[PDB]
Design a protein around this ligand. Sequence first.
Ligand SMILES: O=c1ccc2cc(O)c(O)cc2o1
Ligand SMILES: [Cl-]
Ligand SMILES: [Cl-]
Ligand SMILES: [Cl-]
Ligand SMILES: [Cl-]
Ligand SMILES: [Cl-]
Ligand SMILES: [Cl-]
Ligand SMILES: [Cl-]
Ligand SMILES: [Cl-]
Lengths: 114, 114, 114
Amino acid sequence: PMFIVNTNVPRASVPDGFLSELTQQLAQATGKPPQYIAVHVVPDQLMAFGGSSEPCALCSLHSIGKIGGAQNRSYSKLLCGLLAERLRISPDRVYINYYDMNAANVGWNNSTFA
Amino acid sequence: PMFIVNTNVPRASVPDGFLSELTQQLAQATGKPPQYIAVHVVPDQLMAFGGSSEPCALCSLHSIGKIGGAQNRSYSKLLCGLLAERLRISPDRVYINYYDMNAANVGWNNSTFA
Amino acid sequence: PMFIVNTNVPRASVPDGFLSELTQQLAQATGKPPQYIAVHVVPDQLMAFGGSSEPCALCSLHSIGKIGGAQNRSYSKLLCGLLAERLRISPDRVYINYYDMNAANVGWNNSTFA
Ligand SMILES: O=c1ccc2cc(O)c(O)cc2o1
Ligand SMILES: [Cl-]
Ligand SMILES: [Cl-]
Ligand SMILES: [Cl-]
Ligand SMILES: [Cl-]
Ligand SMILES: [Cl-]
Ligand SMILES: [Cl-]
Ligand SMILES: [Cl-]
Ligand SMILES: [Cl-]
């Protein structure tokens, strides 16, 4: 899976070890091996949420499977909790788009997962 | 909904009020309340469009519904118009990908919209 | 089509002419005119792959058609090869997500491709 967070919070406010925490928590939540988890955090962005530039985040999670109604509710609670605790972003200022990718549409290591 | 614009135009050429204009115009165009509109502008990017690096933009609009043939033509006229007027990007150097998101695949506030 | 690469490799390691190489190689690979190929390279990112901060890349290719099982395997070999040769990123530290876009969902030049 791949998790991306774009935020207006400054880089210096992203704590040390945040990418590793995201990797470990996503491996556990999605069931996927840590080897297959990629994470990307983009601070210092020019963004607004509801017209306000108070701290906010726009995120995405792409995964081959492990996406669905109940699972995405669970991921949203986990990820909003991490963003609130570590980046001090209110959960009502976070969107996370979820994508269930077909294995044929994910390239890796000179091939695809199909 | 969420609107993202990535552009090679420099940050100093993004005028004051641009995120607010996008928020308000997208609220009107999508019919969704502005409280629900998130916007993200990414200037100074390393980009080419058709092999050249005159001003260009790559954008996306994600929305739960309010996406379709006619609506997307209307969004493109509105958004290209704003990028031309405010960022001086020619409409023929803009791509906007549209995504009609299922409510279960949009997280917010510790849950999803489903 | 649109190709985006996000990577932790530094900007100075992206060779001169890389955007043009991606444009031309993608025009050939997809069969589409170079005028329609847009490319975006984002270096210096805060990213991890498999928990590791060694060089990695997260990429996407969006195209109206020219996406499928065999084509995506061929694109992945081409693109991993370019990232390995030009950016020194190991292919097993690259993801590429592929998207077959409906023409009605790709805006351009005040309208869509539909
Ligand atoms: O999904 C959303 C996004 C923003 C938002 C803002 C509000 O003030 C509210 O009452 C509900 C909301 O729901
Ligand atoms: Cl995956
Ligand atoms: Cl589920
Ligand atoms: Cl897919
Ligand atoms: Cl929405
Ligand atoms: Cl429509
Ligand atoms: Cl969806
Ligand atoms: Cl295309
Ligand atoms: Cl589509």
